């Protein structure tokens, strides 16, 4: 039953088994319920004038943050960063969600959804030690349709940044989007005055992450039509996963979910990125590529 399966899903998750997320699509909901772990968040959005935001505050129940919100979508907009519990991982606000609209992970699972901002990046910083045994945490990126997510670890903290644009600014994500992501990472790493003035590209992102974090994973769209998006350099401490690859899937989406779970006293961190194809009516999904990584 939905109930027994959901309980089983939770038990696996609570033991650090990320297979519970494989091939089941995206976890994405606009719901907002307070969760137990403290985490900091930041935003760097490319509008005129430029905008920056650092939040060292908790997200309460029923109450979006207007600076992590987009009024351009739907009859009343949607949050770009929100927290909620696992009784309902995904809702009708998500198209790449199938399995998660039917089954759940119980209300004992805490979820942090980090989407990109209108023209920039949103990011969070969470200490591994904040995680409690029996209370798994999942940082989800929602449905990726061209945006880039970054998961990185540095001195006991996990950083997750999602950058992109909700408008059709061709080439934005692989250039300005990288600038916004680096600025957010700088803001989250104790640099109140970030100074990124060089040439931006996904390669710059790789180099930056290699130099400033212990290990990282970039989930992005690689296209020959937008060559700034193509990574050409290699760094031992930076993994990359092109969920979109030159008009492939022609119709689909990517996912990026990172789980932090304390198993027998030890906090385990695992990240999973997948690429899916969608049918004409977007009613069914098919997994095409997967990247699994332990941090």
CA atoms of 258 and 292, how far apart (whole Å)? 10
What are the phi and psi torsion angles at 268 (to 5°)?
A: -100, 140
Q: Which domain holds residue 112?
A: 1-295
Q: Resolution limit in angstroms? A: 1.9
CA atoms of 81 and 74, how far apart (whole Å)? 16
CA atoms of 215 and 80, how far apart (whole Å)? 25
* Overall domain count for the chain: 1
Sign of the CA dihedral running 35, 69, 241, 205: negative
CA dist 261 → 53, 92, 271 (Å)? 28, 27, 12
Residue whose C-alpha is closest to residue 214's, from 270, 156, 153:
153
CA atoms of 148 and 254, how far apart (whole Å)? 10
CATH number at residue 93: 3.60.100.10
Does residue 239 contact residue 293 with C-beta atoms inside 8 Å? yes
Which technique?
X-ray
Does residue 112 contact residue 138 with C-beta atoms inside 8 Å? yes
Beta-carbon neighbour count of residue 237 at 10 Å? 14
């Amino acid at each position: 039953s939905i109930e027994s399966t959901s309980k089983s899903n939770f038990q696996k998750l609570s033991r650090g088994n990320i297979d519970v997320l494989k091939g089941r699509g995206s976890i994405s909901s606009t719901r907002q319920r307070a969760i137990y772990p403290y985490f900091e968040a930041a935003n760097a959005d490319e509008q005129q004038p430029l905008f920056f935001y650092i939040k060292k505050d908790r997200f309460d129940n029923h109450g979006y943050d207007q600076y992590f919100y987009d009024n351009t979508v739907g009859p009343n907009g949607i949050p770009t960063l929100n927290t909620y519990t696992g009784e309902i991982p995904s809702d009708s606000s998500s198209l790449g969600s199938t399995y998660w609209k039917k089954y759940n992970l119980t209300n004992e699972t805490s979820i942090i959804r980090v989407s990109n901002s209108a023209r920039g990046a949103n990011g969070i910083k969470i200490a591994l030690e904040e995680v409690q045994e029996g209370k798994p945490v999942i940082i989800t990126s929602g449905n990726l349709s061209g945006s880039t997510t970054i998961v990185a670890r540095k001195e006991g903290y996990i950083y997750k940044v999602h950058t992109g644009t909700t408008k059709s600014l061709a080439g934005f994500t692989s250039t300005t989007g990288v600038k916004k992501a680096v600025e957010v990472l700088e803001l989250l790493t104790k640099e109140p005055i970030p100074r990124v003035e060089g040439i931006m590209s996904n390669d710059f992102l790789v180099d930056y992450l290699s130099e400033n974090f212990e290990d990282s994973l970039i989930t992005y769209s690689s296209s020959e039509k937008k060559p700034d998006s193509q990574i050409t350099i290699i760094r031992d401490n930076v993994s990359v996963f092109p969920y979109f690859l030159d008009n492939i899937p022609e119709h689909g989406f990517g996912t990026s979910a990172t789980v932090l779970v304390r198993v027998d006293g030890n906090v385990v961190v695992r990240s999973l990125s997948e690429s899916y194809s969608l049918n004409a009516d977007a009613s069914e999904i098919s997994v095409l590529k997967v990247f699994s990584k332990k941090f």
